[PDB]
Amino acid sequence: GLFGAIAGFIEGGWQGMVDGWYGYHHSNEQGSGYAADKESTQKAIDGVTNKVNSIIDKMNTQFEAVGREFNNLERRIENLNKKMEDGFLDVWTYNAELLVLMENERTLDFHDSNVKNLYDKVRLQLRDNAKELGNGCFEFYHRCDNECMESVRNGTYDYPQYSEEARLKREEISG
Amino acid sequence: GLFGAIAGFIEGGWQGMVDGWYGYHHSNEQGSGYAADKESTQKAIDGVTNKVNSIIDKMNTQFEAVGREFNNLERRIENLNKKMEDGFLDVWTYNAELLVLMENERTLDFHDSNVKNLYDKVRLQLRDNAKELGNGCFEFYHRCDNECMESVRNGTYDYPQYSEEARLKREEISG
Amino acid sequence: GLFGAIAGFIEGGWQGMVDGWYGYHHSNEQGSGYAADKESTQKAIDGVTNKVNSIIDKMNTQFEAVGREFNNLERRIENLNKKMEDGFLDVWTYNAELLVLMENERTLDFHDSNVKNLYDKVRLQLRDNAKELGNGCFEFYHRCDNECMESVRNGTYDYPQYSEEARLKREEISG
Amino acid sequence: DPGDQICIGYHANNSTEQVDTIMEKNVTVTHAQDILEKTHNGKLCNLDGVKPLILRDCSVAGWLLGNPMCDEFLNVPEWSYIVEKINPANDLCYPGNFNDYEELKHLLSRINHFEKIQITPKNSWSDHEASGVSSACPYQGRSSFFRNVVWLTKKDNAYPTIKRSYNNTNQEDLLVLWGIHHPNDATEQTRLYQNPTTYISVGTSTLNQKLVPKIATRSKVKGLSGRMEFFWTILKSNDAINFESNGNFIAPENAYKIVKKGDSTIMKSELEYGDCNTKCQTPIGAINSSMPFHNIHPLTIGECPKYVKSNRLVLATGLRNSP
Amino acid sequence: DPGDQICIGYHANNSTEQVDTIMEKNVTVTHAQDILEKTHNGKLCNLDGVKPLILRDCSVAGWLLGNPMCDEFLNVPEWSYIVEKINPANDLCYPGNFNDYEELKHLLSRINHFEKIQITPKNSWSDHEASGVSSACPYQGRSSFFRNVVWLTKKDNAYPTIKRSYNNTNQEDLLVLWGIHHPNDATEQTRLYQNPTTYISVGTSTLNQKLVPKIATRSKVKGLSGRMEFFWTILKSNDAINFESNGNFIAPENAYKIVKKGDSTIMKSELEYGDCNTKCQTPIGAINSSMPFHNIHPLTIGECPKYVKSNRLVLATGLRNSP
Amino acid sequence: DPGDQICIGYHANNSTEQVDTIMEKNVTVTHAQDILEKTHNGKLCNLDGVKPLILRDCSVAGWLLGNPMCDEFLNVPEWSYIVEKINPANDLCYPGNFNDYEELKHLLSRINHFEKIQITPKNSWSDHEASGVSSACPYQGRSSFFRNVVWLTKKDNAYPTIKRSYNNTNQEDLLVLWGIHHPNDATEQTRLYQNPTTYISVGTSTLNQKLVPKIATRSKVKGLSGRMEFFWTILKSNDAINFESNGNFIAPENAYKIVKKGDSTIMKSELEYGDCNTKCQTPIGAINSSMPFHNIHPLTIGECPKYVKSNRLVLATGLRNSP
């Protein structure tokens, strides 16, 4: 895509994740599990839906062909009428095809982005409290129970509350 | 969106900064104050201005409807004439509306990138001489007078001249 | 660009690298040399070739004017006919021009992005085992032979295999 | 040893739904939306409540003039649209032509209902024979003629000048039809209308028409070398139409009240009534689709999707699918 | 302890301007640019320096033929464009029709200036009556006639064959007008022109017209059952026009020099002159705008913005504004 | 001491190729691809194997009727397309008009080959003089006439009624041409055709034409006040055409078998044959290009690129180049 996230640095999506479009996998003392980010997928479903209503509404007012008859001494205007009607059909066929192609690629680069923006979101909350493995994952320098990780997902994460525990762990291995 | 910048990591714009589009807030021993980034604000006004002039110029040669009259035994050709003119008025309306929509979203994502490109411009210059707060701000690991910050704004910034001041300050808190 | 890579924070393209579109320059104990990233360069060639085949094929179906003559008591339909054919030529000229301008810019932002994907590809494999100079280059905290750097290019890089060695090199400088 | 971990990730599934972009072909996505209707019922249906007027092997001319092979349509109900075959068999039974036929057909595309009424009874011609008929226009074995017009010939051995008039006292406009017969020779002319030099005058508030027969040798068509040329006008409410003739006059018997104008068409289809019902009809089949687009046929009538020439139109809604 | 700080941020303001994109609606931005003109002055103005020809209750036909109620227009100045009401009251006062009217009108839309001249003085008809007049064509309460043509009737009880010819010695082309009168019955024919069987020949280097009156009964229009049928032609410089008639001739008196051709139109508007000036005129009002687009009316003349059917076209110039 | 280093970078060269975008003009790129053909050979070529029919100074009418100055084209070979000059000198030699000419010329755009045949021998007019000639129709210094039609005049002092008939027994359809002469005055009329009141009847299964001369005073054109009007029809295979006349008849001598139908056009060009060959022809030059677009001329024939009015169409394939 436009930076390398969806089928990028995090190679692969999670078939196991069935609650949403963008989300999290968590692994702590209380097992593992998938959890979808409700807010940014809803914001993405809204936009993809509006895009789809926008593209249909842009074609509502579009040329409509009418059968006209012409006699055998009106072959010029008959050709005029045909060329004109085929003309508008080729034009709108072009418009419909091109908008779909153009918006398809943008929709993919949009999903792509929402995955990276959600990633810098967590990467900015955690900072030096975790090591960034570079596969889309973060390995905490402290323990994060199922209530600490709820905090990173909805922007509630408290950084100083885990700052010191984490500082010790990078120094423990570096000591 | 395609960013995680505008209403992203720097949540909110600066109403106090009225000199430009992209710029800096600086805080040292010598009070506070706003300074618009000269380079990236001009490159953004020109590019956006050019876009609005390209789009108007691309529509100058566009269909022109003319009133034509027909008698009551020319209803096929009158209907032909009507459909042709509405056809072109619709086609160019589609062209006008759709291009405005398409360039608007590109324009918003354009301002957007310039916020992230300006942030990474500084973040790559600062490196380990500053702490990345994750709110769009950088906290220096050294002292930066109102002439030091001029160096970060125009990309001349000399890193080793402040490395040790910063290296040592990193030693105090990590000790 | 819309990312700030091509003519952004990585200043300049490499006239010396003539094997591909995106790649690396490396300098260690076994001399220096450029190496084109085959993976992202062919995939960029695929898309750019297709885009050009998509743009030509979507215009295959395009209006073709025909000479129609009219006598001097046919001035209305002669006029209708002129406006109609000029009408379709103006539309397709707009379509061809606008599609070319719009896809050109996207093509520059596509190249711009692939430079960003390749840089972030490296940035995630290296992590704290290398220092980011901020000019698009990385300085290893270890020695990297012609098999270590071939490994970072194809995403094979093993981080723990240099994890311990890199830490010491970081403390040696922090001593 | 490895501690606690969180990962950022996206959705995937077993979807084989493919999309295209400008740069990439056959891209597999998690969710797509087909926006192009590609199927029809292959049948001619009602349009909402209203049945089409399906002429069979009759042409519009046959129906309106009353080609005897078309008596099914002597009094048609209100229609939604008109279906005509590409090459109708019962057109003008007697050889000839319909003047401004294509303009009449186009007028007809704006009409949903006629009420046929008699403006001149066959029994009002006391000085003329009102029974002219032809083998080219057979009814039930015998030689007949169009029903809505009358072939007038000399009575005894005379053709008095006709001065006949009709006022449209009806509220609605009248489609009035008439004709002129072109004989083959001066003798045929005299055998039928006595007078050698004839005319037809037609007057209205806007019409000031004069017809003269063209007596000439022509190709035999249906064994006939004679020709019949037909004319029409819309008589506004409260206007009168004046006919004066001394021969070759094929006079009006029936005319049509324009009861209802509306959205309508004349479809070219060889299909026939399929006792179905639809809100979107094409000449090759009807459409019941929620799609914004279709590629069935450019000539539709009703509440239809938009026609395009595409073979496939699929929007990506979800993201690229993970192996 | 906390030291020195730098921050990256963007502009915001008190802007409420919203724009749309494909994905997002009503988005508030810091700076936008309306590119669509939505207002006009509701007037018919001059185009650059030049006043339109505003027919009031006169049609083009009435003006050119010289309907007595249109005497305001006997000699109009150079115009920029022409305005006609949708249904002018002063058209053809005597009932009838104008031949190739829409073609004449289309020609007229390519003309900025006529110079009217007398090609035949009324005091040149010494063997015919040139005072034909009608109640359908009133001037000041009493019966008059078109001013640019003459109704010729028999003098004493004779209608000599008229042979009159006119050579366009002017450099410019002449629009020449004439007509034929269609009486209701043979008796009217003799009362007016004596001779029973009449004709009109009109000849030119390109025109070879023969007209014969259609004498028949028709509906009363303005109390008249008669009709007047009008013809026109362009007589090129140095060509002559030849008239031969035996009756029913509505002869030319004045004709028009085509002085200037150009871009012009015939607007259909109920508006009238608003004593203003514009570089862009529409049937419903004038436009003074720097906008590249407008949505006022499709049928414009002048240096105008481009028409679209949109209600809103707003370009975002600045960035998304933070609430 | 400095250890190992890796850098991320992209391709560059000394290329000067520029493209445009919506936001940026004159951007220098590493690789671009011109898609717009802008050059032609300035010549008229064959279209694939087949030479065009270039009328020189003859119009299609001059050719088809056989203007004596057009004998070059009496029997032309199969053509690919037709080239006519903008205002050919040799048109209708005798002043007048060709009826439904533009309709015939359009018909002509779907025909690649005529084969001319004799429908009436010149020596078959034993009761009429078939040697009518005119100064307006010069051949080699003397007065001549159209070659494919014949001017019949009275013989001795009679114009017996002509009844001439022809059945198209050929497999292919016939283009048949004829005409009527309009004299200046009754004296010329009797001087030429004896009979004062004449007609021309033309009959077919579809055609029922009656012509009557229009005898009137007209402008001299090439010194002539007489006019000649020409008519045509496509006589279907197995149909017959019937002529009846007692004067003013310009009778058919030759007609055209429509032997080969196809894609063709009538280009308007002042060019001449350039002994070249192409698969794409425009009125001002031929096209040998693999480009998907060209801007040479909108009216082309052959397998051509698509026309645009653009001066430049350049696609960016490579990336932005470093100065």
Ligand SMILES: CC(=O)N[C@H]1[C@H](O[C@@H]2[C@@H](O)[C@H](O)O[C@H](CO)[C@@H]2O)O[C@H](CO)[C@@H](O[C@@H]2O[C@H](CO[C@]3(C(=O)O)C[C@H](O)[C@@H](NC(C)=O)[C@H]([C@H](O)[C@H](O)CO)O3)[C@H](O)[C@H](O)[C@H]2O)[C@@H]1O
């Ligand atoms: C009414 C009728 O039967 N007319 C035929 C005519 O009868 C003549 C008789 O009325 C007169 O008083 O005396 C002579 C004897 O000298 C005749 O007996 O005779 C003609 C010669 O056979 C017939 O022409 C033939 O007609 C064929 C077609 O006939 C019809 C038709 O079917 O269309 C018969 C209709 O009765 C008749 N209709 C009317 C209103 O007259 C029509 C009509 O005349 C023509 O169709 C109009 O063009 O014709 C063939 O055409 C055959 O080739 C021909 O010889 C008279 O039909």
Ligand SMILES: CC(=O)N[C@H]1[C@H](O[C@@H]2[C@@H](O)[C@H](O)O[C@H](CO)[C@@H]2O)O[C@H](CO)[C@@H](O[C@@H]2O[C@H](CO[C@]3(C(=O)O)C[C@H](O)[C@@H](NC(C)=O)[C@H]([C@H](O)[C@H](O)CO)O3)[C@H](O)[C@H](O)[C@H]2O)[C@@H]1O
């Ligand atoms: C010119 C005139 O007065 N005509 C009316 C006629 O008068 C006769 C006169 O023409 C003759 O030379 O001398 C005799 C006596 O020897 C008469 O005095 O009388 C007719 C019968 O009453 C009128 O018919 C009436 O026409 C009405 C329409 O009148 C006009 C009109 O205003 O349009 C009168 C115009 O003067 C006349 N113009 C000309 C040039 O003749 C026209 C014109 O005749 C018609 O427009 C031609 O179609 O008609 C009503 O139609 C009324 O119903 C009817 O009784 C003669 O009008």
Ligand SMILES: CC(=O)N[C@H]1[C@H](O[C@@H]2[C@@H](O)[C@H](O)O[C@H](CO)[C@@H]2O)O[C@H](CO)[C@@H](O[C@@H]2O[C@H](CO[C@]3(C(=O)O)C[C@H](O)[C@@H](NC(C)=O)[C@H]([C@H](O)[C@H](O)CO)O3)[C@H](O)[C@H](O)[C@H]2O)[C@@H]1O
């Ligand atoms: C054939 C001939 O001699 N025509 C001229 C005519 O001669 C008379 C002759 O026809 C008659 O039988 O006998 C008397 C004496 O006993 C005459 O001698 O006389 C006319 C009067 O001057 C001439 O008119 C001039 O014709 C010019 C055009 O002449 C042509 C032409 O070039 O088109 C000559 C052609 O031979 C002739 N063709 C035919 C088939 O008749 C045509 C044709 O008549 C006209 O085109 C008809 O529309 O005319 C000029 O028009 C000149 O202005 C005029 O005075 C006859 O030439």
Ligand SMILES: *[C@@H]1O[C@H](CO[C@@H]2O[C@@H](C)[C@@H](O)[C@@H](O)[C@@H]2O)[C@@H](O[C@@H]2O[C@H](CO)[C@@H](O)[C@H](O)[C@H]2NC(C)=O)[C@H](O[C@H]2O[C@@H](C)[C@@H](O)[C@@H](O)[C@@H]2O)[C@H]1NC(C)=O
């Ligand atoms: C229409 O009238 C013109 C002008 O008549 C001449 O000019 C007057 C001012 C006056 O001096 C008259 O006495 C003149 O005849 C006339 O054109 C002229 O024709 C004469 C011969 O008759 C020529 O000598 C003169 O050169 C010519 N002038 C021009 C400007 O052409 C027209 O008659 C003739 O025109 C020429 C061009 C030929 O085509 C000839 O056939 C034609 O009769 C006259 N037009 C008509 C249709 O009568």
Ligand SMILES: *[C@@H]1O[C@H](CO)[C@@H](O[C@@H]2O[C@H](CO)[C@@H](O)[C@H](O)[C@H]2NC(C)=O)[C@H](O[C@H]2O[C@@H](C)[C@@H](O)[C@@H](O)[C@@H]2O)[C@H]1NC(C)=O
């Ligand atoms: C057509 O027939 C009707 C039925 O009589 C006529 O309408 C009536 O005419 C009388 C006067 O003759 C008038 O008092 C009535 O008001 C009128 N009825 C209606 C419903 O309009 C009509 O005759 C005349 O109609 C008037 C309106 C006028 O136009 C006059 O010119 C006309 O002669 C008949 N129409 C014709 C053209 O003969």
Ligand SMILES: *[C@@H]1O[C@H](CO)[C@@H](O[C@@H]2O[C@H](CO)[C@@H](O)[C@H](O)[C@H]2NC(C)=O)[C@H](O[C@H]2O[C@@H](C)[C@@H](O)[C@@H](O)[C@@H]2O)[C@H]1NC(C)=O
């Ligand atoms: C033109 O000449 C041909 C050749 O003789 C005629 O066709 C033949 O017509 C007879 C009947 O009269 C028929 O038995 C033959 O089969 C037919 N020939 C062919 C090859 O089909 C033709 O006469 C008539 O042709 C038929 C088909 C019919 O349409 C009839 O109306 C027509 O008169 C001649 N055409 C004319 C107009 O005289």
Ligand SMILES: *[C@@H]1O[C@H](CO)[C@@H](O)[C@H](O)[C@H]1NC(C)=O
């Ligand atoms: C994509 O797949 C379809 C069938 O699944 C095939 O018809 C089409 O040709 C493929 N695309 C290309 C570019 O070959």
Ligand SMILES: *[C@@H]1O[C@H](CO)[C@@H](O)[C@H](O)[C@H]1NC(C)=O
């Ligand atoms: C956008 O704003 C306008 C302003 O009145 C409002 O009427 C409209 O409903 C809004 N549309 C949406 C989709 O919110």
